[PDB]
C-alpha cells in the first residue's frame, strides 16, 4: 500500500543534510536524505519518477571605473533549454546583487562562449557585488548509507554531467530527467547525492533576492505510507 511524494531541499522532515563540496577535485556529498521514523520505507525508481536539480554557485566582485562587464566566471556556461534571453527562460542563467546599495541588479547581455556578461549598473569604486550563476561542469550521482555510517554502494555507476539538468526544459513532460537504477531506504538509513566539480555550490545566502534558497534539488518518489 503505497503513494507518491516528493523529497526535496526541505521535504518531509528537517533531518536532511545540506552541505557544500571542496575545491580540490574530489567528490563530496552535497545532500543527505535520511528516512524518519514516520515512514516504513522510501523507494526511488529510475526511468519512472522524475528528478529536478537547479544548481547554482557564488562569485564576488569589487567595484571601480568601467566595471560593467563581468569577467570569466570560472564556469562553462550554457543557455537554459538552449535559449539565451534571460527574460524568456524557465529560470535565470544568473542573477547578481549589489551589497553597497543592497539591491538586485538586472543583466543586460551575455557571452556564453567567453563566459562573460554585461550589466547596466556601473558600480562605484570600492563597491561590492555578488553573483549567483548556474553551475557548469559537474559529475553527480547517488549513494547509499546504512544506519552505521558505511557506504553500501552507489547506484548505476555512470555519473551524469551537471549541464544536462540545465540543457532541457525540466518542467515539460517527456523532457524531464529520469536517471537510472533503483534504490530502497529504511528508517535510520541515509541516501546521499554526491558531486564532483571545481566550483562551490551554495545555499541559504541571505542577500539573494528571489528566495531564501539560491538553488534546489527535488525528486519524485514512491512511499509506503
Amino acid at each position: 500500500y503505497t503513494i507518491s511524494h516528493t523529497g526535496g531541499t526541505l521535504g518531509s522532515s528537517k533531518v536532511t543534510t545540506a552541505a557544500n563540496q571542496t575545491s580540490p577535485q574530489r567528490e563530496t556529498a552535497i545532500i543527505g536524505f535520511e528516512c524518519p521514523r514516520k515512514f516504513a520505507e522510501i523507494e526511488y525508481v529510475g526511468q519512472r519518477d522524475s528528478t529536478r536539480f537547479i544548481p547554482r554557485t557564488t562569485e564576488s566582485i569589487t567595484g571601480t571605473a568601467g566595471d560593467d562587464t563581468v569577467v570569466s566566471l570560472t564556469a562553462n556556461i550554457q543557455p537554459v533549454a538552449g535559449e539565451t534571453a534571460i527574460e524568456d527562460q524557465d529560470y535565470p542563467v544568473a542573477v547578481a546583487y549589489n551589497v553597497t546599495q543592497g539591491v538586485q541588479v538586472d543583466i543586460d547581455a551575455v557571452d556564453y562562449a567567453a563566459d562573460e556578461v554585461t550589466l547596466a549598473d556601473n558600480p562605484a569604486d570600492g563597491d561590492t557585488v555578488k553573483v549567483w550563476p548556474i553551475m557548469g561542469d559537474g559529475d553527480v550521482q547517488f549513494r547509499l548509507v546504512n544506519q552505521f555510517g558505511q557506504e553500501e554502494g552507489r547506484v548505476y555507476p555512470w555519473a551524469t554531467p551537471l549541464y544536462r539538468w540545465h540543457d532541457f526544459p525540466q518542467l515539460k513532460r517527456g523532457r524531464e530527467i529520469n536517471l537510472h537504477g533503483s534504490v530502497t531506504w529504511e528508517e535510520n538509513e541515509t541516501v546521499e547525492v554526491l558531486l564532483d566539480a571545481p566550483q562551490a555550490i551554495t545555499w541559504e545566502d541571505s542577500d539573494y533576492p528571489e528566495g531564501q534558497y539560491v538553488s534546489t534539488f527535488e525528486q519524485d518518489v514512491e512511499i509506503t505510507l
Binding site: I3, L10, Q212, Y213, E218
Partner: protein, 173 residues
Amino acid sequence: GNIGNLSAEKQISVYDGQPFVDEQDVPADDPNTPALTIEGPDGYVIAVDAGTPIAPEFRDSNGNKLDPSTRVIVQKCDRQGNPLGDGIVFNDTLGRFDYEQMRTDPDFMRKTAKSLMIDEREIVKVFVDIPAGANGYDADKSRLTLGDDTSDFGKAVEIVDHDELSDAETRAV
C-alpha cells in the same frame, strides 16, 4: 421545445470565487494553517478522477510569484476538517508550474495521481509550506483553477445530485 436529457454528472472546473470555497491570508511559515478550505456544497457530491490538472496561480501582495521551493499540497480532511494523513492527491512545488502556460500546454500540465470523492460535507484543504523570508500569500491577488471544462485536453470535475444506488455505495466510506 425540448432541453435534451442530460447526464447529471456535470463536468466543470473549480476556483475561489464560488460560495463553497473560502480563502485565508497566510503568514510566512505556518504550513498547518489552510490557505483554502473547500466545503461541500450541501446538496451534491463531487468526484475527481485521477489524472486531473491544477493551476494554482499563487503570488504575493506585491504581486510577484512566491518562492519556487515552496511546497504545495492538496489533502482531504475529515468532516471536522483535520488532515487524514493519507488520501493525498497532490504533492509538489511551484517551480514545477510555469504560470504562463501551466493550464495551456498539456506538455506542461501537472496532473493528479489519485481519484477522489467529496460528499455534501467532506472537506479539502490546500496547505502551503514556505520558508520564512517569503511575502506570505495574498489570496485577493492569487487564485486557483482546478480542472478544465473547456478544451479537448485535460479533464474535468464531476458533480452530481443524489441518485439511489450511487448514494448507497457512496456512503461506503
